[PDB]
Every structure is written in structure tokens, then in C-alpha cells.
Amino acid sequence: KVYSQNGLVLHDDANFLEHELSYIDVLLDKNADQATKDNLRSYFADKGLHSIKDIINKAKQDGFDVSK
Amino acid sequence: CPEQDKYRTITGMCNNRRSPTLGASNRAFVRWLPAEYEDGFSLPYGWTPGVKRNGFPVALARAVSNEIVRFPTDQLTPDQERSLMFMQWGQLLDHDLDFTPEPAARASFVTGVNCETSCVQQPPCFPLKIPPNDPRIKNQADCIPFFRSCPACPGSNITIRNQINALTSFVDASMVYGSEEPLARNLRNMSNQLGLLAVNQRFQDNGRALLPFDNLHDDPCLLTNRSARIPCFLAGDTRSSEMPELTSMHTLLLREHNRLATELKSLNPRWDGERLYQEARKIVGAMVQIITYRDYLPLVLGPTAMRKYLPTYRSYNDSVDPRIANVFTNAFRYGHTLIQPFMFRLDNRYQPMEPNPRVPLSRVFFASWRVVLEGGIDPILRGLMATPAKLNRQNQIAVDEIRERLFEQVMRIGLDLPALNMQRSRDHGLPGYNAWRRFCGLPQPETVGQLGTVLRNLKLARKLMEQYGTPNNIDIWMGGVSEPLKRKGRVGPLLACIIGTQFRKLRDGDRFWWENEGVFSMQQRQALAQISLPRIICDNTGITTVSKNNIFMSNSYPRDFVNCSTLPALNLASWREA
Ligand SMILES: *[C@@H]1O[C@H](CO)[C@@H](O[C@@H]2O[C@H](CO)[C@@H](O)[C@H](O)[C@H]2NC(C)=O)[C@H](O)[C@H]1NC(C)=O
Ligand SMILES: [Ca+2]
Ligand SMILES: [Cl-]
Ligand SMILES: [Cl-]
Ligand SMILES: [Cl-]
């Protein structure tokens, strides 16, 4: 939902967050522990983002530059 | 729900096992008195012209503010015994307790009018009309925007309108961790098993963590300095960026969490991320409760009301209603009388810090760029400790930085926070001043003279009668802050009762109260009694000289300050598992 005070949108729980880009870096890190990447994919899966493509496209949809 | 558990839920669910929704987020407020609406179930008083309340016309909130609350800023009276940290903790605490959602502006696309822009009184708008000869808004066709709070029962048929509390009523540090499972996880660092909260990835504060950035397509913080492009922050409560002073307290508790989770890891290597997160969350939650009830509330209520409304704790009581009363959301706005018109920033010497050491509040609202680009949170926290709060006088209620210029950098027009409070109480159908006096067992004045006796101020009782006509119609906030302050307190008897009662229930009706048997061990409870807000500042900032307890009373440097080496650090030795 949307948190609104005096017409200002203070939070939108549907929007990709900036610090979640560091998670994308982990997934695309070849040497990164596989059990960690699997936990991140379950994190993103719980938000409707299943393929790496869905995750990147959501971050892009929400105003972030994707070059990965 | 769980036959037995150890940590509280994020939403507050099943804190009370006999009624698992009590205190849980996204539930209607509890009403200590039946709602009073113009038409009896939804319309606020002042909605329909010519419709009186108790035989008198409804007073324009903006007019009451102009004639009662307005005073010359420069004549402000400093509080000789309250720091500006006293005000700020009240705001942060309130953001642990209540948040009343409003409809988003974009819902007006194919429906109704845009309350941001239009002055048409149409759902969901309830704009404040401009009185004649207004000192700032000289166009009476204008208005101050106002969205009605969302109803607890959408639409509905003959259901007394009520409002929703999006937060957990419990004092559980939900302004850090959130009040819903998705946000709570979004706030957490899910790339390892350390149980940390997510921190900013683009900026630090002298090597120390900053809050992560929130993502808002129409971010208000970007408007405060277009070249800086610093958006608002993300925290357990969505208002974290309203003020850099507030932001600094959020940032402080975020660091404290990651500091605790770090130590607990070294202490118990076998614990996984979830375990570390929950244990550090439980300590922080107890720290907030301790600071609130041990240090803060005694200075709000004063000794007399403290002993009366918050007697010595006994044990948990599952018959206590721990919800936030609808009236508390407005009554706890007394803190607005404490607000100074500037943000004070000091250096390591507690001297004014350049660039700007005395910034008017009308240029700090949503100014997240100031935290990131103008020296972090250390200069802010130092100003909060070594600056006196504003004292509340019956002819110096609230400054004009919030009465004339609230959010003017992100709004088509400056807002009037005192007026918003009174309009808000009407939006929530709250009873008038005498209705709450009675509820609290206090005398109810009918005439200017009797009101003069209650207020010990014949002049103010006169201006209130001229605006409202009868003391029965005085909006609860206006009447609450108009009363003389109790001995060694900063609220009158009426607000001491409402505020005192609320926090009693939040203590006695909280199964996870830090002193309740089973929550912590004996060695852990004795360890937590040693914590203090000045020590938390020492542990998570570059500041090495901090206020001496009570931090909310200490407010002058170097008289009321000590070196960080003198205070004891929290001993987590009892958190060791064999
Ligand atoms: C908005 O932010 C800009 C950019 O940060 C401010 O200009 C800076 O002022 C700081 C003072 O701490 C200096 O250290 C920098 O050299 C300045 N940066 C630039 C880009 O010149 C600017 O002052 C702010 N706007 C206002 C109104 O204060
Ligand atoms: Ca809470
Ligand atoms: Cl109520
Ligand atoms: Cl909260
Ligand atoms: Cl007061």
C-alpha cells in the first residue's frame, strides 16, 4: 500500500529499493556463495520476482539504471 | 497462535493471547469516548455551514490558530530544564505508536478532486477555510490542504466512522523495524547471516552507517535542494525524513541494532541471522521502553501525575486494552509547543557549526540532503542535547515555522500545524474539551470565569470563549496545551491524564514488557537497567562528550555534560549461551 501524509507519498511498498541493487550484484557474482544467492532468490521470489530478468526489469521499472 | 513464543511479531499480532488483534497494526483506534460527528456517524463538525456544535458556530481552525496560537517568534521563552532532545524523543516515540493513513493524492485522478490543489470541500478533502484579515493567506478563496484520514470500515452503512492505526500500539521500536512483514524484511540486510538492518549503499557518515534510501517517484526530499538529488530515507516509520533531527534518531537506533547484532555474533557464533536480528531487536525495544518510562515520561507528566497514572509496575495483565486511543493521536501532539524555530548544529566543541548553525525549520523539512552533505548526524545530535527546548507559555503556544511555513518547500502553500491538529480532531470526531475533562474526572467550566480559574489565566479563557463560544467546543489539542503545566511537568492535568492513561495500558497490556517475567532473565534485566540514551550516542557516533542523565533535562554545555568514558556500556555477557 501507499503511506500518505498531507498528500505526500512517504512510502510505496511496491517500489524496488536502492539497497536491493547490492543483492543483484551478489546474484551475478560468479564466485558468490550459492546458498546465499539461493536465499536472495527466495527473497525476491516472495515479492513476485522469479527470474533474474524479472528482478532487473523491476529495478528498472522503478527508476534505477540497469547495466548488468 | 504459538502456544509458546519468544519474540514479538512484527505486526503485534497475538501479544494478547485471548484477543490476538489487540495492539496489532492496521486496526481501528479504540475510542475512550463515543465519536462526535456533525451528522452522527461520519461528517466532521464544521463540514456543513450553519450547522452549530452545542448551540455555537464551529470556529475555523485557522482562525483559532491566528488568534490563540500565534505569537512573536523572537520573544520565544527557552525552557531552562528541557533539552531539545526532550521534544525530539517525543516525536520519535509517537512514531512508534500511531500513524493514521490518508488517501493518496493520485486516487483523485478519475474520482473526486485533488485536495493538494483544489479548495472544493468534497470527499476525501476537508480543506481549512481562510478567515478574513488573515496575516498570511490574504485570499479567502484559498485554503490549507487537508485529506480526511481513511475510514476503518471502507464505505459502509450506518457505521460510526473510525480511523486506522497502521503501527503496533506497543512500545516495540516499530519505528525502526516496521509494523508489517514486507517492510520489516525490506529494512533488513538479507545478503548474509549477520542479522543487520539494511544500510545506505551510496553514502556514509564519517565511516558510519546511514539509513538506506527509500524509493518515492515523487520524492519530497529531492525538492528541498534540486542540485543535491538526495531522496528521503527508509525506516520502520515512513516519516523518518520529516526532519533531520528525527532522521538522526532513526539513524542512531539503526547503528545501535547493527552494533548489538555484531557483538551478539562474536558472543554466540552459532546464532544465525534471524536469531541475531530478533535478539538485537528485543534489546532495542527494551531500550526504548526504559528511556520512555524511566527518563522521558516523568518529565512530561511530573511527579504527581506520574505516581497517579503510572503506578509501580506489577506484572502483565491480559485484560488490559493496549490499543492507541483515537484521542491520544491528537493529545500527544502537545510536543508541537516544544518546537524551536531553528535546527541547531554544533561541532565537536559544542560551538555553532558552519555552513549553517541556525537553520529555520522551513528549510529543514524533508531536507535529507543536510544529513548526507552537511556533516552527518553528529552536529544534529549535539544541537539537540545542548539547546534548550521551547517552553510552552499560555501566550506563546507554537512558533510560526510550523504555524505558517510547515512543509512550504514541498507544498503549494505553507501549512499551519496547530490548525491541522484541530481540523484533525474534527476529522476523527473527537469530543470537545469538557467531554475529556469529565472523562478524566476534572471540573468542566461553562463560563469564561470558570474557564479562567481552570487556566489560571483570565485573558486566555477570554480569547477561547470568543473563538469557540463555549468551553464544550474547544478542540482537544487547543484546550490541552492551553492548561497550565503541572509541577515539574510540561502538560496540564487533562493531557497528563490522557497521556498517562495511554502509556499505563501500553505497559500493563504488553506481554513483552521488558520487566515482565520470562521476557528477560534476571541478569539481563539488571544489565538493561544500565542503558541510557547518552550511552547509545557514545556507542554509535563520533561524539565523545554527551549529556549527563537526565538527558531530557540537561540542556546547557559544558554545565550538563560529561565524557563518554564515564558512562557504563551495555554488558551483553548474560546473553551468552552455553
Ligand atoms: C544544496 O547542496 C549543495 C551541494 O551540496 C550545496 O553547496 C555545497 O555547500 C557545501 C557546504 O557544506 C560545500 O561544501 C560544497 O562545496 C557545495 N557544493 C557545491 C555543489 O557547490 C548548497 O549550499 C545547498 N543549497 C543550499 C540552499 O544551501
Ligand atoms: Ca510500536
Ligand atoms: Cl477516543
Ligand atoms: Cl512504528
Ligand atoms: Cl502543554
From TrEMBL, chain A:
Recorded protein name is Myeloperoxidase inhibitor SPIN
